[PDB]
Amino acid sequence: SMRVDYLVTEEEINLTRGPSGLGFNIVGGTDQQYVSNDSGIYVSRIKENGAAALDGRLQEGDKILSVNGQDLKNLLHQDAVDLFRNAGYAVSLRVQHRESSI
């Protein structure tokens, strides 16, 4: 049973909220099909000195698959925003790091 990937492209990241939030910006959603050829919620910016920045693992361009196990597929942009806001202090993200079609 493989529990170690040759290439680590997907990752679970456990963040804790700071005073300014989780410390990243998102784009995407079912109402933002123009953003990507692979619809979902993406990290557009890691905020300088914020929670996500200090933690080190989240990257700009990450696709966030789920928050606390809740799939972000099928969500409007605003519905994703509300989810993050509703997630409490500790937040578990499952992400797919950037992968480019050539």
DSSP lists the bridge partners of residue 66 as 71, 94
Name the token pair of 54. Answer: 């200090």
Count the Cβ atoms, other than its own, within 10 Å of residue 94: 18
Q: How far is the CB of 23 from Na ion (least distance, A)?
A: 3
Is position 87 an interface residue for Na ion (rule: CB under 5 A)? no
Taking CB under 5 A as the criterion, the residue among 13, 27, 53, 87 binding Na ion is 53
Name the token pair of 4. Answer: 């170690």
Q: How far is the CB of 86 from Na ion (least distance, A)?
A: 20
Is position 57 an interface residue for Na ion (rule: CB under 5 A)? no
**Of residues 63-82, those binding Na ion (CB under 5 A):** none
The smaller minimum CB distance to Na ion, of residues 23 and 29, is found at: 23
End-to-end CA distance of the chain: 31
Taking CB under 5 A as the criterion, the residue among 15, 23, 80, 91 binding Na ion is 23
Strands 63-67 and 41-46: antiparallel
d(CA 39, CA 44): 14
Chain positions contacting Na ion, by CB under 5 A: 23, 47, 50, 52-53
